[PDB]
Amino acid sequence: IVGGTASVRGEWPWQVTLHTTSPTQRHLCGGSIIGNQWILTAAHCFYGVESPKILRVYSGILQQSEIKEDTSFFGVQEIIIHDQYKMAESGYDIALLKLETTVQYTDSQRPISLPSKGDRNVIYTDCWVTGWGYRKLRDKIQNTLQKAKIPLVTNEECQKRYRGHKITHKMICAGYREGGKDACKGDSGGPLSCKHNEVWHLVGITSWGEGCAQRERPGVYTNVVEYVDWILEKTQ
């Protein structure tokens, strides 16, 4: 996260870190707890992941250095990728992870609600993006979970900044005109969380963008509301 600050223990309990063991163990992507054995993330994270066996979902983690060899994780039983996904910029950058076991909800690990279908005429103004991603375009992956407050920009407005691509209604954009605050590489698949009437909602999944925190270049997120039917169908 570019231009953010450090999160506190249990500030974003739905945030998970998604590890790969091949070739060696490292943070791959972000994800959100939405059900007892369901992580909502971005499809582009799994390019070149061939077996769900090389994945490790760690929850209740604030700092990466908390993860030791004996720290427990949730195994991925199934990776579900939207049939229509081809690449981030084309859309359908959405994926589910069905965990081998259910999460035991505590204060440091617990779920975020999806938006409602009637919540499509709702305008979120209290939105936050979170991850262990890069602090700048040419950086590394952070030890402490970073947070940054960011305002949504309208699909129409976003489209003007990105004439190199099509910005569909199944996407949502968020950024500052002058930039400075944005998600970055490694934040992918993590949450953009917006608070509506004291209830936190999963409004977007971190998908892509032109560089990181560039001015006039808003972050692009998978519009979660446009997928509730897809998600519910899959989460059974």
UniProtKB/Swiss-Prot annotation:
Catalytic residue list: H44 (charge relay system), D93 (charge relay system), S188 (charge relay system)
Boundaries of every Peptidase S1 domain copy: 1-236
Residues that bind heparin: K160, R161, Y162, R163
Glycosylation sites recorded in the entry for this protein: Q63, Q104
Disulfide bonds: C29-C45, C127-C194, C158-C173, C184-C212
Outcome of swapping G31V: In FA11D; mutant is not secreted by transfected fibroblasts; dominant-negative effect
Protein name per UniProt: Coagulation factor XIa light chain
Gene: F11
